[PDB]
């Protein structure tokens, strides 16, 4: 009944946890809450402006999935197609596991499996992780200015830690997947977001380098985790001081585009790629995705043993994932309110979206701070939901 | 009949495979096969000297796990010995696995684990390690001039691959046992050494750093193979290319010791250590170790299921490992000539050594190739082993 | 050549981790080995008197199952009896776990179970144990005035912690063979073992209560561990403290018996006692016990995956399970040095014997302290292995 999203949003602020958060629900297409808290940045504590821009990281990735779900209903590819009919690079697959023994795949690598987190790719910054360390060497996360076209073909050359189909491991796959749509309409993802995505949500302000009145409307980014160092053995202390992205995430490089990470967005944009969600259609009526592939890419298409979903061995309780990201699959497994059936997905910098379509709601919280020790997006979801039916 | 050492040492030279070899064999303490070919470097094409000096490397460890089971003989510890009463850095370790999960240990590190590579640590060129990754980072081996003592307090702080006693993987732990060799006795390694084992073997040319006149005795090392840099997805090419140490091995060091290398020696030096293996005594008669611990020693004690014994998944055929190094257990399952309870170790410059007590035989090749992808060592051994009758 | 067992025991004393220690090692039956250190009670520091007198504790079990087998070849009994027939107290037992659940025995218990500590019996300290707890209040160890018939019938009561013959516990089950003796034989298991073990052995400070001259003889003990009160959650600390044996081991009560625990002996009788199991005769060459026979109690028995012999997670390296105690059956993952069928046992006070067959080698070591962190016994065997040649 209280406005348990702004007490929370604020209370973070409050706390210097964080230096500036805005917030948005959706209910049928429509705000029902919303707010900010905070500053554009802690050092001038100058005021959030309108329209305010953040890095989204791997928010990234839902829409460079719908992005292939599309584009399987058009016919370009489909879920079953291996990735090497488009790219022979990725002919040739090995696999290393963690005592040493390198072996070759035993599974070609397919378009789901690049969905669904099973190709056996990693991450730069995976602990533990019997591969990383040669991404890290490859600079695969660092090197932002590198072309995705030439980043893939160094990518290509590593092993996998599984054989593909058999596992899931959150990963650099999402990255392999925007390649893959380069190679096989022969456009760039960054074009074809914009003409099938973008465009028909008036998604102004969403892309990979900022819009032309963008600098002064770039949200500051605080926080110490590292998305390509030496991955760390306890979590990076939550100070709110500016973090370093090096050439990770050039703001103005035409060529910068990526599958996993990279676009900048708003609350305003971001929600309107959710509320599309509800129904895969626009708010005039186009069908930007079937009601049957929409349906095909939001069932719950990976399920998880007693461990459950993990991420660096941060659990996602009573999760399941599909095709998009997170779907939650169990209420009585969940950590936080939710509903059978909401999904979505979050970013480093710790924005936080879901779709919640037993309530017809959205909602979206948008901050910049890498490396949380504090879970915001999951406490704002949970406040939202106490405030709904 | 034929001279097969000679042939494989030869054939190995004039392939252009290694600068120079030297090998002797022993049967009951007697010199019965013994030779040398190549030179000490192929940059002058100088002949390789008399009493000719060679970086063991793991060679090191029978020498080192050899004096921990003198001082066990004398009291200093024993087997079940926590190694954190010795040095209580090592209090409280963590455990770290493929998936990014760390925990607690669920059991105290012993000299036994060390002794057995069953401690849970790793080593700076393991590949697909959950851990390699801050060995390198911390340098444990790359910064050979970092004293022992705070080379284990930054290892100290870094998480085992595994519950102690639970699994086998070849590291850093004989490392380990030097430090808490010296945290046991109040003395320095290389002094206990000198004094437990060289003097009493007349080994007058083996220790850490060279003798004054050891300059112009130095085999040149050739190779590859790094034991610190990104592990190699595939094996280095073998090519006669001067190898570059860094500050890993210094030559003049006063204080470098370590327990998994370092040592300098000679193959007469090196036969008198083995040929006290097939007894325990000194030539002259006088006891280095009792026959009831050198039993306790040399007995197989911990067996591999599966795939056997493996380094970086490389194959240890028929091999099990005792408190020494290898022990043949299954000539059955032996990849080459050999006899149950043939035992040794080598170096990852290509020394190797073996004891065999059942033709009262020893012998020894010496050379100096860092990641050979030819297998000197064992087709010397073959060679030898077909030679008697 | 250096007498490492004075070294060991004078350690230990200077340290003030023991009062006092003495030890023999025989070969064939005469001593090679032999010393004391120390005194008889620090308070007053009275030297080690003439045939000076110890709780042996534990090292009752040997003696007490050596004498079952001597009943069992006389036709008294056999392995396969089930002890109900002999005490029908000990019909339908149940067997209760860790989650409560209480059930009916599905075997029942034998001679051969007692012998092994496969009955499902435990101990009153047995910690973390599903009926240790209901032991400790029925004061089954710490009620030493209570007959040995009465104690048991309080025993019969209570429920097994696994079904016979299934499970190895270190337990109270020698205790219940000498009452089954008691019942098989219709005489006093002391009176027994008089008549069959001490005086053919010429054992004559053993027994039950104190010679009438044992006063001035008898050893103070020390220490903090309790083997009736609340199992100690970690070791209790090495303090050279008088023990309180409260009313658990009375020194002249003349109905104190028990199985597996309460003699009181000298270093000299459990040598004789030690020396005979190595031909099962006296030294005039009397048998006490058949070859054959002897054999039957000697072969390991039971056999351990994993984690290997454990009491109260104590482990003991090596070490099967015959009918009179530990037998060693492999050296190669024994903790100390040892030879191929040593075997022996030890009790709680620290006294310690063996008996090693391929070197007809006999040791025991005798000291007063409960609770040792300290394995003296293994030291000094040890110590004695190394000794020989």
């Given at each position: 009944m209280p406005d348990l999203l702004t007490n929370v949003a604020e209370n973070y602020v409050n706390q210097d946890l964080f230096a500036g958060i805005e917030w948005r629900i959706d209910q049928?297409?429509?705000?029902?809450?919303?707010?900010?808290?905070?500053?554009?940045?802690?050092?001038?504590?100058?005021?959030?402006?309108?329209?305010?821009?953040?890095?989204?990281?791997?928010?990234?990735?839902?829409?460079?999935?719908?992005?292939?779900?599309?584009?399987?209903?058009?016919?370009?590819?489909?879920?079953?197609?291996?990735?090497?009919?488009?790219?022979?690079?990725?002919?040739?697959?090995?696999?290393?596991?963690?005592?040493?023994?390198?072996?070759?795949?035993?599974?070609?690598?397919?378009?789901?499996?690049?969905?669904?987190?099973?190709?056996?790719?990693?991450?730069?910054?995976?602990?533990?992780?019997?591969?990383?360390?040669?991404?890290?060497?490859?600079?695969?996360?660092?090197?932002?200015?590198?072309?995705?076209?030439?980043?893939?073909?160094?990518?290509?050359?590593?092993?996998?830690?599984?054989?593909?189909?058999?596992?899931?491991?959150?990963?650099?796959?999402?990255?392999?997947?925007?390649?893959?749509?380069?190679?096989?309409?022969?456009?760039?993802?960054?074009?074809?977001?914009?003409?099938?995505?973008?465009?028909?949500?008036?998604?102004?302000?969403?892309?990979?380098?900022?819009?032309?009145?963008?600098?002064?409307?770039?949200?500051?980014?605080?926080?110490?985790?590292?998305?390509?160092?030496?991955?760390?053995?306890?979590?990076?202390?939550?100070?709110?001081?500016?973090?370093?992205?090096?050439?990770s995430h050039p703001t103005d490089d035409p060529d910068f585009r990526r599958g996993g990470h990279g676009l900048y967005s708003t609350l305003d944009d971001y929600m309107a790629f959710a509320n599309m969600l509800l129904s895969g259609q626009t708010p005039e009526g186009e069908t930007l995705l079937s009601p049957a592939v929409l349906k095909l890419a939001l069932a719950p298409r990976v399920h998880f043993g007693a461990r459950g979903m993990r991420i660096n061995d941060e659990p996602f309780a009573g999760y399941s994932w599909n095709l998009l990201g997170r779907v939650m699959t169990d209420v009585g497994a969940a950590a936080y309110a939710t509903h059978l059936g909401e999904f979505g997905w979050s970013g480093a910098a710790a924005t936080y979206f879901w779709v919640d379509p037993t309530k017809n709601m959205t909602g979206c919280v948008m901050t910049q701070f890498l490396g949380s020790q504090h879970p915001i997006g999951s406490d704002m979801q949970a406040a939202a939901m106490s405030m709904l039916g």
């Amino acid at each position: 009944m209280p406005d348990l999203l702004t007490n929370v949003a604020e209370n973070y602020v409050n706390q210097d946890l964080f230096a500036g958060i805005e917030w948005r629900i959706d209910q049928d297409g429509k705000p029902i809450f919303q707010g900010c808290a905070g500053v554009k940045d802690i050092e001038t504590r100058t005021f959030i402006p309108k329209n305010a821009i953040y890095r989204i990281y791997s928010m990234t990735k839902p829409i460079v999935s719908f992005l292939a779900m599309m584009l399987i209903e058009r016919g370009v590819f489909r879920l079953s197609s291996p990735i090497q009919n488009f790219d022979p690079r990725f002919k040739s697959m090995k696999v290393i596991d963690q005592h040493a023994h390198i072996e070759p795949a035993t599974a070609l690598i397919t378009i789901e499996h690049l969905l669904t987190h099973q190709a056996g790719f990693s991450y730069d910054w995976s602990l533990g992780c019997p591969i990383s360390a040669h991404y890290r060497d490859a600079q695969l996360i660092e090197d932002g200015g590198r072309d995705l076209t030439d980043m893939m073909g160094v990518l290509a050359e590593l092993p996998l830690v599984f054989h593909p189909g058999t596992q899931w491991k959150y990963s650099i796959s999402t990255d392999v997947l925007a390649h893959i749509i380069e190679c096989a309409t022969g456009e760039r993802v960054d074009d074809l977001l914009q003409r099938l995505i973008f465009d028909p949500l008036d998604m102004q302000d969403t892309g990979f380098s900022l819009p032309l009145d963008g600098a002064s409307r770039l949200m500051e980014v605080y926080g110490m985790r590292s998305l390509h160092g030496l991955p760390a053995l306890k979590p990076a202390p939550h100070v709110l001081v500016p973090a370093d992205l090096g050439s990770s995430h050039p703001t103005d490089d035409p060529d910068f585009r990526r599958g996993g990470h990279g676009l900048y967005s708003t609350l305003d944009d971001y929600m309107a790629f959710a509320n599309m969600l509800l129904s895969g259609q626009t708010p005039e009526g186009e069908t930007l995705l079937s009601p049957a592939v929409l349906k095909l890419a939001l069932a719950p298409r990976v399920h998880f043993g007693a461990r459950g979903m993990r991420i660096n061995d941060e659990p996602f309780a009573g999760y399941s994932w599909n095709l998009l990201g997170r779907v939650m699959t169990d209420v009585g497994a969940a950590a936080y309110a939710t509903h059978l059936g909401e999904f979505g997905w979050s970013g480093a910098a710790a924005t936080y979206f879901w779709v919640d379509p037993t309530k017809n709601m959205t909602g979206c919280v948008m901050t910049q701070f890498l490396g949380s020790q504090h879970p915001i997006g999951s406490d704002m979801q949970a406040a939202a939901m106490s405030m709904l039916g």
